[PDB]
Ligand binder design. Structure first.
Ligand code: A1BR3
Ligand code: A1BR3
Ligand code: ZN
Length: 140
C-alpha cells in the first residue's frame, strides 16, 4: 500500500483505490494502473520533473529503502493477476529489485522529488508507474 500526496491530490495504484477515491475521482487510467482523487488537506510531496534513471524506492516487504537504476517509462506486457487480465501497461519503468504484491504504492524518488510508485513485480524485478509526465499535479 501507499500514496503520493501533492497539493490537494492523492495518487494511488488504480487497483488499490478505495470507494472514497472513486467518489472523488480527478483522473484515472487502467493502462497505467493509476488513479488520482481530491483531498481536503494539502500534501507535502513534490513531483520530480526530470529524466533521472537512478533513485531510491521503499520496499515494505523488506522495511528497506533500496537504491536502484530503472528503465525509461515504456509499454510493457504484464501477466494476468487478480486485478487485471494479461495486458500491456504503459508508462512503466523496470528495475532489478525485490517486490511482492503488497509493496504496490511504495514511492520511488530521485534528487528532484517523487518519480513514481511500485505497480508490478516478479522474477526479481520491480515495476514503477511513472508520474513525472502528469504536469497538472503541480497546480489547481
Ligand atoms: C523516506 O521515504 C522515502 C525515502 C526514499 C525513497 C522512498 C521513500 C518513501 C516515501 O517517500 N514515503 C512517503 C513513504 C510512503 C510510500 N508511499 O512509500
Ligand atoms: C509489486 O507487485 C508484485 C510483485 C511480485 C509479484 C506480484 C506482484 C503483483 C503485481 O504485479 N500485480 C498485482 C500487477 C498489478 C498491475 N499493475 O497490473
Ligand atoms: Zn530526477
Amino acid at each position: 500500500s501507499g500514496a503520493i500526496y501533492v497539493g490537494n491530490y492523492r495518487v494511488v495504484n488504480r487497483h488499490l483505490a478505495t470507494h472514497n477515491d472513486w467518489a472523488n475521482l480527478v483522473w484515472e487510467d487502467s493502462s497505467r494502473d493509476l488513479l488520482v482523487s481530491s483531498t481536503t488537506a494539502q500534501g507535502c510531496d513534490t513531483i520530480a520533473r526530470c529524466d533521472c534513471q537512478t533513485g531510491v524506492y521503499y520496499c515494505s516487504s523488506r522495511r528497506k529503502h533500496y537504491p536502484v537504476s530503472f528503465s525509461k517509462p515504456s509499454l510493457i506486457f504484464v501477466e494476468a493477476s487478480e486485478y487485471y487480465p494479461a495486458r500491456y501497461q504503459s508508462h512503466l519503468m523496470l528495475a532489478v529489485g525485490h517486490s511482492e504484491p503488497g509493496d504496490c504504492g511504495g514511492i520511488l524518488r530521485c534528487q528532484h522529488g517523487v518519480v513514481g510508485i511500485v505497480s508490478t513485480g516478479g522474477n526479481g524485478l520491480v515495476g514503477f508507474a511513472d508520474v513525472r509526465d502528469l504536469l497538472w499535479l503541480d497546480e489547481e
